[PDB]
Amino acid sequence: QFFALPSTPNEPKAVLYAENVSIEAPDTHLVYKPSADLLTQ
Amino acid sequence: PFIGTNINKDNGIQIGTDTTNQPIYADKTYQPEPTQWNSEVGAA
Amino acid sequence: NTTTYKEYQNVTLPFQHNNSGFVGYMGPTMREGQAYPANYPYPLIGQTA
Amino acid sequence: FPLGGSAATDTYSGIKANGQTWTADDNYADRGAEIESGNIFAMEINLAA
Lengths: 41, 44, 49, 49
Known about the structure:
The structure is cut from a larger assembly and holds four copies of chain A.
Chain A: no helix or strand
Subcellular location (chain C): Virion; Host nucleus
Protein name (chain C): Hexon protein
Family (chain C): Belongs to the adenoviridae hexon protein family.
C-alpha cells in the first residue's frame, strides 16, 4: 500500500509494507484498556 | 488537569451529573488526569 | 499522634498525593496529574514535625 | 525513547494508477501519520555511569 504527501505532489513519496500477522504476548496484561480501535493501551 | 467541558463564571470546571455538576475547592484535581497519551485539548 | 495533633485529618488513598503529572493515578498508569507539593507523608523530622 | 513513536505525521493521503495516480478510495482522508520517517527520536544517558 503506497501513500502520499500533503505536498500532494500526488506521488508515492512514501510507502511501507503492510503485513497482517498473529499477535501473542505471553507476558502482558493490559492495565488500562479503554481490535483495531483504541491505541494507547 | 481535568480538561473538562464547559467553564463558568462562579463555576468553571463542569465535572457532570443528573443535570450538570461542578467541583469545588478544597479538592480540585491536584493529581488526576488527562490518560489517553494524546488527549489534545481541542476546542471546547 | 492522632489524639494530640490539633490539625490532623486522615486522608484516604485516592485523595492522597505526592507527585502530580509525575506518577500515574492509582496504579502503574503513566505520568498522571499536573504538579503540586506533596500531601500525605506527614513529616516526622525537621524544625516542623 | 518517546512515549508513542513520535510526531512528524507526514499527513499523507492516498494512491492509485498513472503516477500512483492516488486517491486510494479506501481513503485515509489526509490520515497518515506515517511511521514518521526514520528512527524514533530519543536521547540517551549513561544509565550506568
